[PDB]
């Protein structure tokens, strides 16, 4: 028994939020009044890894109920999933400054994972939560260690899950941001994606996306994992994007 363990009565679930990210999540309340999210259900069912990692851009774990039914108590994000937010009614108004700023926050969370010597293994818009003030935080650490279309080929084929394979997933995530949440590799099935990517195919520049931002994607998609950039580099590049890289960016129809 550790400090994370809490009794089951201390939780007071309220309204259902939906499923996804290894299943059911409820909006509820903790000690009296404390709005939290409760993910309910294999006892391998995400908690042991969130205990060591704490960062402003990672969804923070609050407490765990280790017995069946196993609960996972984390902070509450008001806007929900990033993929839903991009596809939802609010996402249509997002422009490149907001999308790049959201990518910078995600890279900041993964930069913490990077220097902690961890791997996420399932980084994508569906596993990123949005809160107030367009705050984005990384979630989904059920697979975290020390979705073929989002997975680096050396990880999907051989299990070589490194922080550099997360960098590959980040490049795919950039296409989700610049297309308002569209599925990558449109019109391609998983086995076709794996075939063409191994042979060197990469997604083209999304419409209205600047070439400089697409070059960052291709860098994340290099065949050699060691040649992929670090999240420390990705964070600094995206935070300084509209001053150092695209100082003459002009708004368009969608970006
Ligand atoms: C691993 C990432 C993840 O858990 N994603 C996820 C997906 C579906 C439901 C819950 C959930 N987890 C969390 N959600 C919140 N807050 C929140 C979720 C969903 C919504 N709405 C979805 C339905 N409507 C279409 C739009 C809004 C709102 C708020 N907070 C924390 C977690 Cl862990």
Curated annotation (Swiss-Prot):
Enumerate the subcellular locations listed in this protein's record, separating them with semicolons: Cell membrane; Mitochondrion inner membrane; Nucleus; Cytoplasm, Cytoskeleton
Keyword terms of this UniProt record: ATP-binding, Cell adhesion, Cell cycle, Cell junction, Cell membrane, Cytoplasm, Cytoskeleton, Disease variant, Host-virus interaction, Immunity, Kinase, Lipoprotein, Membrane, Mitochondrion, Mitochondrion inner membrane, Myristate, Nucleotide-binding, Nucleus, Phosphoprotein, Proto-oncogene, SH2 domain, SH3 domain, Transferase, Tyrosine-protein kinase, Ubl conjugation
Annotated GO biological processes are: angiotensin-activated signaling pathway; bone resorption; branching involved in mammary gland duct morphogenesis; cell adhesion; cell differentiation; cellular response to fluid shear stress; cellular response to hydrogen peroxide; cellular response to peptide hormone stimulus
Posttranslational mods: Dephosphorylated at Tyr-249 by PTPRJ. Phosphorylated on Tyr-249 by c-Src kinase (CSK). The phosphorylated form is termed pp60c-src. S-nitrosylation is important for activation of its kinase activity.
Q: Which GO terms describe its cellular component?
A: actin filament; caveola; cell junction; cell-cell junction; cytoplasm; cytosol; extracellular exosome; focal adhesion
Q: What main location does UniProt list?
A: membrane
Tissues expressing this chain: Expressed ubiquitously. Expressed in the skin (at protein level). Platelets, neurons and osteoclasts express 5-fold to 200-fold higher levels than most other tissues.
Per UniProt, ATP binds at: 17-25, 39
- Outcome reported for the amino acid change (mutating residue 42 to E): Kinase active. Interacts with PDLIM4
Q: Where is the Protein kinase domain?
A: 11-242
- The active-site annotation reads 122
| Gene Ontology MF terms in the entry | ATP binding; ATPase binding; BMP receptor binding; cadherin binding; connexin binding; enzyme binding; ephrin receptor binding; heme binding
Modified positions (Phosphotyrosine) are: 249
Additional observations? May be involved in blister formation in Pemphigus vulgaris, phosphorylated-SRC is abundant at blister sites but not in normally adherent tissue, which corresponds with loss and disruption of CDH1 in cells adjacent to blisters. Phosphorylated SRC is increasingly abundant at pre-lesional sites of blister formation and occurs prior to changes in abundance of CDH1 and DSG3.
- Domain text from the record? The SH2 and SH3 domains are important for the intramolecular and intermolecular interactions that regulate catalytic activity, localization, and substrate recruitment.
> Which family would the database say this protein is a member of?
Belongs to the protein kinase superfamily. Tyr protein kinase family. SRC subfamily.
Quaternary structure (record): Part of a complex comprised of PTPRA, BCAR1, BCAR3 (via SH2 domain) and SRC; the formation of the complex is dependent on integrin mediated-tyrosine phosphorylation of PTPRA. Interacts with DDEF1/ASAP1; via the SH3 domain. Interacts with CCPG1. Identified in a complex containing FGFR4, NCAM1, CDH2, PLCG1, FRS2, SRC, SHC1, GAP43 and CTTN. Interacts with ERBB2, STAT1 and PNN. Interacts with DDR1, DDR2 and DAB2. Interacts with CDCP1, TGFB1I1 and TOM1L2. Interacts with the cytoplasmic domain of MUC1, phosphorylates it and increases binding of MUC1 with beta-catenin.
Q: So which disease is it linked with? A: SRC kinase activity has been shown to be increased in several tumor tissues and tumor cell lines such as colon carcinoma cells. Thrombocytopenia 6: A form of thrombocytopenia, a hematologic disorder defined by a decrease in the number of platelets in circulating blood, resulting in the potential for increased bleeding and decreased ability for clotting. THC6 is an autosomal dominant form. Affected individuals may also have bone abnormalities and an increased risk for myelofibrosis.
This protein is called Proto-oncogene tyrosine-protein kinase Src
Source organism per entry reads Homo sapiens (Human)
Gene coding for it? SRC
Q: Which residues of the full protein are shown?
A: 260 to 536 of 536
